[PDB]
Motif scaffolding. Structure first.
Motif, PDB file in Angstrom:
ATOM      1  N   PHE A  23       0.824  -1.209   0.000  1.00 51.73           N
ATOM      2  CA  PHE A  23       0.000   0.000   0.000  1.00 51.73           C
ATOM      3  C   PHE A  23       0.859   1.261   0.000  1.00 51.73           C
ATOM      4  CE2 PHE A  23      -3.190  -2.778   2.522  1.00 51.73           C
ATOM      5  CZ  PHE A  23      -3.896  -3.130   1.394  1.00 51.73           C
ATOM      6  N   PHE A  26       4.464   2.436  -3.631  1.00 51.97           N
ATOM      7  CA  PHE A  26       4.549   3.392  -4.741  1.00 51.97           C
ATOM      8  C   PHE A  26       3.608   4.616  -4.545  1.00 51.97           C
ATOM      9  CE2 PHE A  26       0.726   1.976  -7.145  1.00 51.97           C
ATOM     10  CZ  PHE A  26       0.550   0.683  -6.700  1.00 51.97           C
ATOM     11  N   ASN A  79      -7.125   9.542   4.826  1.00 51.97           N
ATOM     12  CA  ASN A  79      -8.001   8.448   5.255  1.00 51.97           C
ATOM     13  C   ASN A  79      -8.556   8.647   6.651  1.00 51.97           C
ATOM     14  OD1 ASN A  79      -7.312   6.486   2.908  1.00 51.97           O
ATOM     15  ND2 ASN A  79      -5.314   7.065   3.724  1.00 51.97           N
ATOM     16  N   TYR A  85      -5.846   1.932   5.849  1.00 54.73           N
ATOM     17  CA  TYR A  85      -4.708   2.805   5.554  1.00 54.73           C
ATOM     18  C   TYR A  85      -4.284   3.663   6.735  1.00 54.73           C
ATOM     19  CZ  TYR A  85      -6.428   1.302   1.001  1.00 54.73           C
ATOM     20  OH  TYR A  85      -6.885   0.566  -0.063  1.00 54.73           O
TER      21      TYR A  85
END
Ligand SMILES: COc1cc(-c2cn(C)c(=O)c3cnccc23)c(OC)cc1CN(C)C
Length: 113
Positions: A23, A26, A79, A85
């Motif tokens: 997650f 990148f 988030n 996340y």
């Protein structure tokens, strides 16, 4: 490779182990997360940090810690707290700051004598 590059690669590998689904591997795109660029002005991810280690862009562990904190802070800003996340970013942040703590770095500084 330089001694700083070796140390930062070691810190990064240990942090990347906490993200098995990649997650934080990148940059987050607007396709993956709608309106991400509208909220997050200073994006960061493990891959960008990896390229900075390889290109010898980190002059200190402090600079490396700042990029790491930025990556986690971005995930906690975009988030909501009850999301995968946000929870993972808070976990990763805590793991990184205990590993790269002032105590752990002072013990490293002392061993360099
Ligand atoms: C669902 O999978 C993914 C999630 C994210 C992701 C990351 N972070 C940090 C977020 O804040 C986030 C917030 N909302 C939605 C998604 C993400 C991702 O970004 C690089 C890539 C994938 C693709 N995957 C095959 C690796």
């Amino acid at each position: 490779s330089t001694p700083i590059q070796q140390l930062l690669e070691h810190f990064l590998r240990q942090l990347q182990r906490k993200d098995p689904h990649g997650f934080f591997a990148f940059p987050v795109t607007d396709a993956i997360a709608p309106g991400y660029s509208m909220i997050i002005k200073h994006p960061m991810d493990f891959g960008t940090m990896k390229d900075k280690i390889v290109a010898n862009e980190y002059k200190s562990v402090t600079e490396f810690k700042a990029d790491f904190k930025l990556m986690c802070d971005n995930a906690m800003t975009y988030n909501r707290p009850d999301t995968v996340y946000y929870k993972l970013a808070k976990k990763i942040l805590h793991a990184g700051f205990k590993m790269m703590s002032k105590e752990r770095l002072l013990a490293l500084k002392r061993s360099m004598s």
